[PDB]
Amino acid sequence: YPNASPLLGSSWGGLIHLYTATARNSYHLQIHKNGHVDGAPHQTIYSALMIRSEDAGFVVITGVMSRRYLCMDFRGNIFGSHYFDPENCRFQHQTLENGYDVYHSPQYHFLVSLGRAKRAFLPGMNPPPYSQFLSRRNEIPLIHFNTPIPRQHTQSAEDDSERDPLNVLKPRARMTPAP
Amino acid sequence: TGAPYWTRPERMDKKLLAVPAANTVRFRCPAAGNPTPSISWLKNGREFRGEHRIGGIKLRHQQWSLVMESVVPSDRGNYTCVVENKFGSIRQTYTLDVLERSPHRPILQAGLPANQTAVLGSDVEFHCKVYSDAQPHIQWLKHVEVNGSKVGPDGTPYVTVLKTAGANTTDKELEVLSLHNVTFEDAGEYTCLAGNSIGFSHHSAWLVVLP
Amino acid sequence: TGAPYWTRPERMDKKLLAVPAANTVRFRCPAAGNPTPSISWLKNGREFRGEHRIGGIKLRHQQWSLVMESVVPSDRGNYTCVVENKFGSIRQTYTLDVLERSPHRPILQAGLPANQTAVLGSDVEFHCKVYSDAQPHIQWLKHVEVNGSKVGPDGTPYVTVLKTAGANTTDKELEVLSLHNVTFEDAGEYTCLAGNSIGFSHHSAWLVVL
Amino acid sequence: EPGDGAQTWARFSRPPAPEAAGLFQGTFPDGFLWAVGSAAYQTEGGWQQHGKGASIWDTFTHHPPATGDVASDSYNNVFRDTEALRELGVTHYRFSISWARVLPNGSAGVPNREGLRYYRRLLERLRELGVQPVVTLYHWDLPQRLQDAYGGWANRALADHFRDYAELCFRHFGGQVKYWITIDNPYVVAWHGYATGRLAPGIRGSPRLGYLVAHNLLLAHAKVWHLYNTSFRPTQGGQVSIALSSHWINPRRMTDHSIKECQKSLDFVLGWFAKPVFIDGDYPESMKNNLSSILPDFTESEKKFIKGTADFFALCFGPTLSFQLLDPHMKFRQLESPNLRQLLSWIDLEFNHPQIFIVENGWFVSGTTKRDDAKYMYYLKKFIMETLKAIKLDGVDVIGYTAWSLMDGFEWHRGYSIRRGLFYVDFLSQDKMLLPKSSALFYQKLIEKNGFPPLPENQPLEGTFPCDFAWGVVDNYIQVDTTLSQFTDLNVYLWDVHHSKRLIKVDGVVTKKRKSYCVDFAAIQPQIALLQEMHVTHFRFSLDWALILPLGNQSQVNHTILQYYRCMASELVRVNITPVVALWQPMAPNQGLPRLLARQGAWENPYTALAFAEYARLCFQELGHHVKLWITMNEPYTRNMTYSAGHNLLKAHALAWHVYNEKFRHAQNGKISIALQADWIEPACPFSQKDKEVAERVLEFDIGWLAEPIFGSGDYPWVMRDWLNQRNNFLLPYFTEDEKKLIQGTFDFLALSHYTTILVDSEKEDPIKYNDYLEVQEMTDITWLNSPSQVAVVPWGLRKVLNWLKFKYGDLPMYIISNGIDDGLHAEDDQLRVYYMQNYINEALKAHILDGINLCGYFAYSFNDRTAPRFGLYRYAADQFEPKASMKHYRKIIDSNGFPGPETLERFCPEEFTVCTECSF
Ligand SMILES: O=C(O)[C@@H]1O[C@@H](O[C@@H]2[C@H](O)[C@@H](NS(=O)(=O)O)[C@@H](O[C@@H]3[C@H](O)[C@@H](OS(=O)(=O)O)[C@H](O[C@@H]4[C@H](O)[C@@H](NS(=O)(=O)O)[C@@H](O[C@H]5[C@H](O)[C@@H](OS(=O)(=O)O)[C@H](O[C@H]6[C@H](O)[C@@H](NS(=O)(=O)O)[C@@H](O[C@H]7[C@H](O)[C@@H](OS(=O)(=O)O)[C@H](O)O[C@H]7C(=O)O)O[C@@H]6COS(=O)(=O)O)O[C@H]5C(=O)O)O[C@@H]4COS(=O)(=O)O)O[C@H]3C(=O)O)O[C@@H]2COS(=O)(=O)O)[C@H](OS(=O)(=O)O)[C@@H](O)[C@H]1O[C@H]1O[C@H](COS(=O)(=O)O)[C@H](O[C@@H]2O[C@@H](C(=O)O)[C@@H](O[C@H]3O[C@H](COS(=O)(=O)O)[C@@H](O)[C@H](O)[C@H]3NS(=O)(=O)O)[C@H](O)[C@H]2OS(=O)(=O)O)[C@H](O)[C@H]1NS(=O)(=O)O
Ligand SMILES: [Cu+2]
Ligand SMILES: [Zn+2]
């Protein structure tokens, strides 16, 4: 017997990655700390978006490592911001007639794309490449989301005449009482 | 030499191929050799042909391609193509992750929220849980009367929102509406309304407070 | 001088194709003549170029075919293979209609049914609503009290459905199973099977009887 | 074979075991050679006694002061050296036979009878003792005549002369001695004697001269070894090697080029002398193709002559080459490192698993220190632990150990300004009697124990904490977020429901706001759920003064913040988590105070104390019915704080406590006291009394400064007042009778917070890191585990500080308000937290059971990782809280109530009557 698969429905609470392809290459949408948005071939911790809805059909895409927001400009160039831009950085979501998502700005009409042929969203005429996204659940463990690891250097007395290499004598900060 | 070699390397870049269910997938490993190497297609590293797949698969040798029509969720995993001959054997592993896309109105649990009664001074809570893949937005509305009746000039009811879906609140803390120390004025019709790109679905409940 | 003709006219007798949704389709319209006729297509009106469909179209000049991947119900219509030569042109038609499919299991309305109590020989009603685009394939599968465990040799056939697929199996009236005058003869849990060409939705909860 | 050690960094790249790194024990293997060494010129002196010759170290320290004419006067004090050896309890003396004394006039001449008589006296004195001697034939003291006539070691005929000298040694002491070393540290005899000129010959010709003289050194060593093998071994049965020496090195970055450069450096320094004698007979290829025209080449006969002429692998890892005399060119811009264990692993891999023998080891001390040294003791302890780890954890055939310089003496370029002796001796005296240093006592105990066996004071204890124990967590940077989730939109909307549910606002109507019942606060429930998961029983957070009263006075109370805190307390109580709050904490941009107070000294004005009294009264009357364990001031900084500030802090704490006691005790029945910070201060040398009283002074300067007025007698600690009066620093305020009566008893439970342990020694050896104000030298042991923040994991410190508190301030109920360590990584650093928490809880249980203290609480630090970064049990990644393994182990300890062992089937506490919690007093 074909044992039942896990329950359908509630799978959007948590991190998602926006996969897309054009039968020549496959990319997951990824937001970089420097405000760069690009397609990573694999699932990177910088590609972990968290889509949250405000109205009925108007999503905002955050990403949990860059801390950016997926925001847009007047010529359609996707980028990442740090402060909310509700008039420009909040995309109307839509689901095409083959299960593929599309995200278009409500005022710019330019579909969210990973390519360089952004266009207006006509009612099912033709989409630009890399604009028909698909949400895939996150499989990256959260331990790799703590990748920022405090690691500084000591380099104490870099001259080649050091008299205490293992740092046994460790002075402790104080306050000398000079009136 | 007779060692196998890929005919087109630019056609072998779709490492992770994901598709909505009931669709068709098309792998190919175009190679050549002297003599032409044979192909072994392994599902998760295990030999596979059109035997455990309902509907059958095609493994035509003329194009070095494997097609799968009407894919199903029970097809996820690695798919390794091997081209082998007496002068070399090489492999390439694609990955298939078939998704399940259901573009319908937000379907929320039946019987929730339900009619409730409470003694004045107690506390109640209403529950509504939605099931839709398009990131639905959930709010709660209490039916109130503004000046006269609870009905507007066009028959449209008067409601006040109680808890909407902001970007700063998770969806675990929105599926419950907690009325603490319910008074007499907070006894009407509470509707959980959910909306995605397809449409809106709402369920109503009634809370009655007794002295 | 003479008008061009086809190389394999035996495949041109099928104007109608009952293709399923979410499946690619190919239209083969081969022809031959002196000189070679142009490979052109049309869609009951304007020129059927690659920007009037979701996913695009591909034209193959080897066997003169037109292919469209992941067909969509909006693709229904009357395509025309028109091959133009200086010595006349050749017309042929394709009437394409798409059988509807659905990229999901029958969406079981969660929470149905409940754990009612059939104490003192009362009656029980059970609910199962599936929000599928098409008409699903639904069985009830009231459990069988054998060995106690509903799963024996990895899915033992405990199916005892009394309302199978048919004209009465739709999304309008078969939502409710009514067991009347229920004595102590059905304990444990029930199930609810729905399915189509993709998968099986199967979920239920505990039951109380006396 | 060459290259087998190139992966040593790779083998040590991965993090080691976080429990066997500092808590590593195990006796050394039986048949171990515990040794203590010495040199010839460093210790003998008597540069012209009994007609000895002139070395090259008597024509270098004499106008090339600080000479070695009489360094330790051990030429005639032969009895005291062996007396010190017997008292030390050692089984191998590693001394040197000086070339110039046994053959003063010439090898082709009469040997000096007096020098041989002295050496035979030494051998017969240390043979009846029970010590097998180890001798080195050449310890840099080449005779001056051989330096002048033939040009020193540069000549190739001089090698033969060496053999002659060696011959007579083999004829005389062959019966007694069974270990010989032909050359000591040939690197600093071929390089710093003939290339840079820093040592005795000091001609600093060129690198080419150094390489040629090293070639001649290798030839002479081969000649002597073959003389021994062919003529003397079948009659005396001994071993001969060459005392090689090396450092450790680490790559700048974990690439392959850097690793190969490190391997090249190690080949340049040590393989340069080790490969020809141990592997094949020629110089390493990493250096042969780098100085082709600089270094000479062996013929095939020479290649067969050098290979296999060393029985064991003598190693000299000390301060004579590491970090002092290594030429930076041989380092190849990598990072030098004194890691003995990795070097031993590299030797074992590279040179075909030989019998390593550390024939010289141990760091140095500044030249002014008397018999109380503690940097040397801990460096020696670390090196011995590294040797033990290499023997056990990696299987390296180490057959002995030799701490260097039994007694002080010359240092060959550092004069008398450096002390390396296990036994102190004052060169300004005339008797020069060996006084045992602290390191001498440590070595005595280490030999007697024969390693580091499991101590009885570190065995885990099985047993349960008493019932009603306060198991809790701590989050003092609580994330206040008073936004209201529901019922916050007052507008009336019109909700069309036919072609719609795009509800539209209708203007002109705004309804009233529902009463702000505190379920509305969204940022409360997740924290309560996280606390509920780990089964804690006391959450501890801190109130914010700058938010409740932003202006400073009672005219601008922010009631919303108080409502949020009252909900936090109510929700905590509702789920059986009794809350503990702290009124003030010094961790804030301005001392945890309102800006108005912070801009007026913020602790010098007594009005700050009065304002804190008013604020404490307000917080007692707002949150007082839910919170019932109050903490007045949470871990004040006892170092980065003045004395008037501490006085006013004490006055404010007394004011707040009396406000509670006189107003809100018969109505709320809570408890209130202060929470200090009590890290343990251990004397560095466990047998000397100066650092003991110095540790006492540091303790009473850290703990007893803010605790004796409250918990103790009432006045400031007497040691602190004496110390401040002796230095004429009359900056300690005096307590008036009114203040002494006010403050003497403002406490209901002692509350400490232990994190680590610091050792203190009372010897000034480098005033740069000295603490002149307290006259303390603060060190840390390096055999302890260290968190990425370089904080010491010391379990027994908690028990020691609890016993000290009970002994000093009577018998009081004690809470451990905060006790936790931090992490920098994510994979294995949390395992360090698991180990530290388990051992610290075990030590607290030990202190409770078999010491009698009334410890009835414990609060693990850092509830989550968002408020306290690098510290939390609940890591905060991608705006999601995931538990660490430390949380699960802590919960396992909690719900089992300690460490019950096999008898985990008892409760035995119905209606608990342990009088430390809220009882009838
Ligand atoms: O073999 C064959 O045939 C084939 O082959 C192949 O194919 C191919 C190829 O591949 C291709 N190429 S690629 O590239 O892709 O790779 C193509 O090609 C060609 C050429 O070559 C080329 O060139 S080159 O140079 O490359 O060379 C070209 O191309 C390309 C493309 O194409 C184009 N286009 S088109 O349209 O033309 O196509 C272009 O493109 C471009 C564009 O642009 C676009 O694209 S598109 O497409 O869309 O157009 C894109 O773009 C984009 C971009 O991206 C963007 N950018 S960004 O940045 O944003 O991102 C934009 O752009 C832009 C720019 O960029 C900018 O700038 S910047 O700088 O900033 O960047 C600016 O802004 O600007 C802009 C603009 O726009 O401007 O945008 C765009 C978009 O746009 S739109 O318009 O869209 O809007 O992309 C681009 C690119 O670049 O890419 O170009 C390209 C180039 O590339 S490169 O790299 O160079 O660059 O051209 C072409 C042409 O031709 O045209 O195609 C080809 C075809 O071939 S043929 O021969 O056909 O002719 C393949 O393979 S492979 O491997 O090689 O690959 C495949 O396909 C194959 O095959 C198939 O087929 C066959 C047959 O069929 S039929 O149907 O006809 O028949 C077969 O089959 C099947 O099967 C079989 C068997 O089975 O066997 C058969 O059958 C038979 O048999 C059977 C048996 O039986 S049993 O029983 O046994 O079973 C039987 O049954 C039967 O009956 C029989 N029949 S028969 O009759 O045959 O006899 C069957 O039938 C069949 O069937 S089916 O159906 O299935 O088919 C085989 O098998 C198959 N295979 S499969 O598997 O597939 O199926
Ligand atoms: Cu559907
Ligand atoms: Zn000391």
Author numbering:
A (entry chain B): 25 to 203
B (entry chain C): 150 to 360
C (entry chain E): 150 to 359
D (entry chain A): 34 to 97, 119 to 975
Study authors write:
To reveal the molecular mechanism underpinning the coreceptor role of HS, we solved cryo-electron microscopy structures of three distinct 1:2:1:1 FGF23–FGFR–αKlotho–HS quaternary complexes featuring the ‘c’ splice isoforms of FGFR1 (FGFR1c), FGFR3 (FGFR3c) or FGFR4 as the receptor component. Contrary to our prediction, all three cryo-EM structures reveal identical asymmetric 1:2:1:1 FGF23–FGFR–αKlotho–HS quaternary assemblies in which HS enables a 1:1:1 FGF23–FGFR–αKlotho ternary complex to recruit a lone FGFR chain (termed FGFRS to differentiate it from the ‘primary’ receptor FGFRP within the ternary complex). At the membrane distal end of each quaternary complex, HS engages in tripartite interactions with juxtaposed HS binding sites of FGF23, FGFRP and FGFRS. In doing so, HS augments interactions of FGF23 and FGFRP from the FGF23–FGFRP–αKlotho ternary complex with the FGFRS chain, and thus induces receptor (that is, FGFRP–FGFRS) dimerization.
The direct FGFRP–FGFRS contacts bury a modest solvent-exposed surface area (1542.6 Å2) and are preserved among the three cryo-EM structures. Akin to the FGFRP–FGFRS interface, the FGF23–FGFRS interface is also conserved among the three quaternary complexes and masks a rather modest surface exposed area (1668.6 Å2). Notably, in all three cryo-EM structures, electron densities for the FGF23 N terminus are poorly defined, which implies that the FGF23 N terminus engages FGFRS D3 in a rather degenerate and flexible fashion. We targeted site 2 of the FGFRP–FGFRS interface in each of the three quaternary complexes by introducing four different point mutations individually into full-length FGFR1c (E249A, R254A, I256A, Y280A), FGFR3c (E247A, R252A, I254A, Y278A) or FGFR4 (E243A, R248A, I250A, Y274A). As in the case of the L6-FGFR1cWT cell line, cotreatment with FGF23 and soluble αKlotho of L6-FGFR3cWT and L6-FGFR4WT cell lines robustly stimulated FGFR signalling as detected by phosphorylation/activation of FGFRs and downstream PLCγ1/FRS2α/ERK signal transducers. In contrast, cells expressing mutated FGFR1c, FGFR3c and FGFR4 had diminished FGFR A-loop tyrosine phosphorylation and reduced PLCγ1, FRS2α and MAPK activation. It is unlikely that the impaired signalling by FGFR1cI256A and FGFR4I250A is solely due to reduced cell-surface expression because the glycosylation and cell-surface expression of the corresponding FGFR3cI254A is unaffected.
